[PDB]
Amino acid sequence: TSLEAIVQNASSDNQGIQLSAVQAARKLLSSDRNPPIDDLIKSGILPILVHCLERDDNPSLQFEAAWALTNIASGTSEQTQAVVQSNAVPLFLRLLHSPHQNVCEQAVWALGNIIGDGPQCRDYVISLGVVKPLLSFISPSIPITFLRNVTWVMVNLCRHKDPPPPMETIQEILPALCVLIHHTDVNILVDTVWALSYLTDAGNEQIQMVIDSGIVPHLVPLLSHQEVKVQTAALRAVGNIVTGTDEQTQVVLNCDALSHFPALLTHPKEKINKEAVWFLSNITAGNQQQVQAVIDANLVPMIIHLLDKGDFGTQKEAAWAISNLTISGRKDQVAYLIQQNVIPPFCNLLTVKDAQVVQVVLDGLSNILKMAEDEAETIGNLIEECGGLEKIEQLQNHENEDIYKLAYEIIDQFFSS
Amino acid sequence: KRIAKRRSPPADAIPKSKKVKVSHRSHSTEPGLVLTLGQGDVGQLGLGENVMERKKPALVSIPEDVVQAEAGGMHTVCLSKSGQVYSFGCNDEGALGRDTSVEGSEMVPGKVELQEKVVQVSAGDSHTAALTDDGRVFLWGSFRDNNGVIGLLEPMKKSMVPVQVQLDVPVVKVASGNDHLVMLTADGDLYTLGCGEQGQLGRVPELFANRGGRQGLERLLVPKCVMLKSRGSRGHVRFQDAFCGAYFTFAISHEGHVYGFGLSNYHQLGTPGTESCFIPQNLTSFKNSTKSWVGFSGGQHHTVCMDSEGKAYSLGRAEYGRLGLGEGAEEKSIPTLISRLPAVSSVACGASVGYAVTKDGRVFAWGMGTNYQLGTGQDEDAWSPVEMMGKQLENRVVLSVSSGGQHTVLLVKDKEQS
């Protein structure tokens, strides 16, 4: 209840006073709420925590200290920076070898916070050699909670794509993830799949590593898993994978990924619909073979259905799917799309306030009309039937340079009589 | 021509970063052993299939050490050192959160179907709530009222297994009445959920009263804070601590003031009148500059509290010796000192009884002895704070105490000598 007493009580030689002062410190989450940040950072309490973190044969002291540093590093980035300036990290790493499980777990927790702060802090913590000791903890005799914290730290390691995580670090993590992906717990699986998600969102290179880890055939079937969260995470991960090159996407496809999507396209959660239609919107942008692989899965009718009766986001992603298939697909493929009654719902989006969607739809229609030559009459009359031509004629206004210019180019080119 | 692949907008960032490890002065840390006593009709004593009753404390077999023990209405929940939760009692409403298909498995303690490191537990009439280290709250069982079942989170639906109360803010303390639950967060915000028929929620004023449809239940079973006009001050009123009576709730703020709300039919809220308090009324009966309130507890119609100096007070209904003041003293609406009590370390209340724990380790009981909750071995109603005695108390000190409907559970530790 006093603001600064501890600094004297923690400097004593009586292990009870010191043990108690750091415990009453451990009560900081509530203690901190009353005073603002600055004063306690200035007076100097933090170094005191580290000094006492060094001394072994007194595990309670180390536990209370690492608790305090833990809850301090949870705050703003400036607070975590204040923690790392104390050079406390090598002492946490020293604590990773402690025989007391509570000390190890607390250290793993705090390192989790520090790593999760930012990419520079992450590269700092890796530069000291935390990855191999952390991964060495994975054993069939590990407690479940401690394992959950370990995986959490893995997720923090894989985050922050701005500077991507080090190559060697990922090369060390991936096998552990391949071991964790078979685990029975739900939360552990979730965190693992999110770690994969960040690894794949990093870029094409890391995606290629994930594919080289042989984990994709084990990841894909999770799309149809019972728990919704595993589904969401797996879908984001795989989608990031197919954001890459052609052959990589083809590796996703060869594991029979499309078979799971009919369910995902009809799943009650709106976010899963959105993310799945996003996925397919990346698939149609691939080569002709992949587009044909989408058509062969009977998925186009549900894509259009969501394009007509889905929410705004899913409608957007579906519009992207149609346009990508339009510029990438063959003539007979776009023909199949047309004979699936895609023109009316695809055109009914021209009335939205989002200029990007309008550019997508107009570009798609323009590409369709440029593609089909003899039936350009027929298709034109099709747009005239669904009233889309009226919408295009009223789109020629000053909302956007591209919408008007492209719009009237379409009109004059394909709709002159 | 081919278009380039599209990237995803950032997501909700579920695993976002640096989750806080909660700490609060209510978290029990010192390990101990569990004792039970009273009616064990449905196995809330955890002593065996053939054990129906114990009139003095008996030891319960737990494979690990126990850091906390709380006794529900007709069940009992223990929190082990390792973090796992053990439950034993009545599983008719799912308050145990584990498979009791095998008859006889509810009669003994069993490991709850949950894999977490739990730091706090709270148990009421028909429910059980756990608080993990990272701050997220689990809850299982069901709620009730003077009326039929009202569900747990989805109205008219009970839960047989632990279910997370998904909240963005970490929670530092959980506290349970009979059929309501309060959660004190780190930021000081105080969330409530459960029944509010008698106003034990505080955030649902006189605008309605027991709407027997899906409308009111739809508003009640969602965790929401209690907003208060801080009289000049911006933001909202913060809170330092909180406690749950049976059908009422108290809370201590940083300003030192004491708030409370619920049913005051027998003046068990310190209010002069029997009017129901649906608003967190500031209690003038507790306003004192010298006295600083630290510990609260309460039964279905009585209330026991304690100050920073160790003196434990009591108020509320007086029948059946639940106050324990003067061997038949009249009903009291104000906190009354019990001169027979030494320096009290912590206080607690049962259904119709009350328990005190002194700093030296002694435990005193008082109230209705129909269920032999008093530990005296006499069903006679005790009006005096009689000391509890038994062989399992020899050379041992009482760490904590909790009491429910037909039983009572203690947490004790061997003395430091030898």
Residue numbers in the entry:
A (entry chain A): 71 to 487
B (entry chain K): 4 to 421
What do the authors report?
Eukaryotic cells maintain an intracellular gradient of the small GTPase Ran that is predominantly bound to GTP in the nucleus and GDP in the cytoplasm.
To shed light on the structural basis for importin α3 selectivity, we crystallized the predominant isoform of human RCC1 (or RCC1α47) in complex with importin α3 lacking the IBB-domain. The tail occupies the entire NLS-binding groove of importin α3, spanning ~50 Å between Arms 2 and 9. The second region of contacts includes RCC1 residues (20-SKKVK-24) that occupy the major NLS-binding pocket at positions P1–P45, with K21 at the crucial P2 site. The critical S11, which is phosphorylated during mitosis to reduce association of RCC1 with importin α342, 43, occupies position P4′. The open conformation of Arms 1–3 accommodates the β-propeller domain of RCC1, while making high-affinity contacts with the NLS. Importin α3 selectivity for RCC1 is therefore a direct consequence of a flexible solenoid that undergoes local conformation changes at the N terminus to avoid steric clashes with the RCC1 β-propeller.
